[PDB]
Amino acid sequence: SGFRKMAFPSGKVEGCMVQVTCGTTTLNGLWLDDVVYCPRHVICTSEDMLNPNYEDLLIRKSNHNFLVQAGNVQLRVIGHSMQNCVLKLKVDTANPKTPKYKFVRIQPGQTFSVLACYNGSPSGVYQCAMRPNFTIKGSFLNGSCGSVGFNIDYDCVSFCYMHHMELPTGVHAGTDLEGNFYGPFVDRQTAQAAGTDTTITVNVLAWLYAAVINGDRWFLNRFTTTLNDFNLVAMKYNYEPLTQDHVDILGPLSAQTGIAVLDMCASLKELLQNGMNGRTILGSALLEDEFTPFDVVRQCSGVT
Amino acid sequence: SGFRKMAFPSGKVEGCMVQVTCGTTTLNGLWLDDVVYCPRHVICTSEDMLNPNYEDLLIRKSNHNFLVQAGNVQLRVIGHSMQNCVLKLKVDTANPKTPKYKFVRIQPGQTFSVLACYNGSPSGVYQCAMRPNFTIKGSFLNGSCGSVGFNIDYDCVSFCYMHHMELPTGVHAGTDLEGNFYGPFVDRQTAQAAGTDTTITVNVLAWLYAAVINGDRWFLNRFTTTLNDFNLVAMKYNYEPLTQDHVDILGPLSAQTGIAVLDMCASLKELLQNGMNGRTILGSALLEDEFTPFDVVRQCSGVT
Ligand SMILES: COc1ccncc1NC(=O)[C@@H](O)c1cccc(Br)c1
């Protein structure tokens, strides 16, 4: 028992982290096989970030200008190319620590672990979720760019995020491993405000099932609701509309606990309307939305 | 910017996890050099846990009865001994992945990362704190025993916890790496209720400084207090008494923000007396106490 914001073990990703330097800018890179992936803003100076022309900036850069260091050893750069907002540095050596891996573009609401890095060195790991407005509420300082988000399915690492920037609102934006930004963000130091950060309803319900599984049951009530009635409440509280796909994905949790999805929705409805009244659920005084139904099952069953 | 419950990168610990089986019981072991450390209750059957005589149970066990598997390869056991509540299995091979390490017995209030394991395989990593009542609020299922807690200072892993049991209250108890339980708990399936779980005041103050550093300042007020006045409030709210050692340890955070420790105490006093009024601090609706002043500085400065 017990429920924690748990991240995947980071070892497989740690063995991929390298330091990439170009001119006077140093950030993190991801070394998989004979390719190093890093944010293209590594070629920029502070003056360039105002409105950079990455194609024109990359013309003045040769393979020898990209310094790639893995631990204390220097990798030899034999090719460089830009794919969207990432640079792919072909090195002469395949990473001997390359795990089985995939590049996946996640959907908003999905979760992933982040290995925060500085100068190619890991500092920590934490669990995140892609917000419905395509930002992530991370913990990153200057030099953390190139740090990646990922999920692990037994031995396969699915890289889904690469950190690129911090918005003036303190929230984070980045790309998938093909260099495509999540959301409308551009890799430019400009006015970029995030949209409405709605609550991931399916995740809150999954976390409510996790609470019941771990003994916290005070919020269970004698009521039920319908998808349309629940969604009227969810709209009022800036919660994502619940769909039959969401109900279907909560099936195993509903089966495990014996609490119908719509009954759990009615508990959530009353919690939205009446608040927690000074009470807590799984050590939290607010409704947690960064655990997917998959995460709850995984943690409550011990998937390694 | 941003503040997260961040764990240490787990790679160095993952390379130490092995599976230990004795009879029909399988749990995790920690392989460092040529020794495997695991909870001594591995020699018990379900019937034995009611009141086990570990010395008498260990007499019927020989080196060949302890099956130690690292990945898919079997380690040869050449010695076995009991140190307090841990078993030390001498193997014929030093772990090639042994990092620089220490065994440390932490104080209540200190934090550490846990690598939850099952059958010698890591499932996840999360940040924990030793509660003042010597329990930890973890996330562990049957088979997680032998999973360890640790801290990392650059390249050195300081192992501080080994998971042994779950109390009927759903909280967790375990030992340091010398086999000594934190708190009064015994490795026996008996009535063991935890003491009062007080709030780690110095950590809440450190987290309040983290909030100011990251932009959340609404809770700052025009007041100050004294250590004795603050402690009258802390006693009423089951908070640990604040000492001059605690004030001293919060010195760097006070210096960074320019907010005197006693002024921050006065903000905490008003938050205890008036609550959050439906507001949040660093995405939490309650006062977070599982970040030490060291953790806040580390995260806010990017120590790798
Ligand atoms: C203090 O800087 C950070 C803190 C956290 N995460 C990331 C950063 N870095 C930046 O945001 C910055 O280098 C930048 C500016 C404009 C566009 C891009 Br692309 C990148």
Ligand SMILES: COc1ccncc1NC(=O)[C@@H](O)c1cccc(Br)c1
């Ligand atoms: C479901 O079991 C768990 C869940 C989480 N963490 C640990 C366990 N295991 C136990 O508590 C159990 O093997 C036991 C019983 C009595 C004394 C000892 Br020592 C160990």
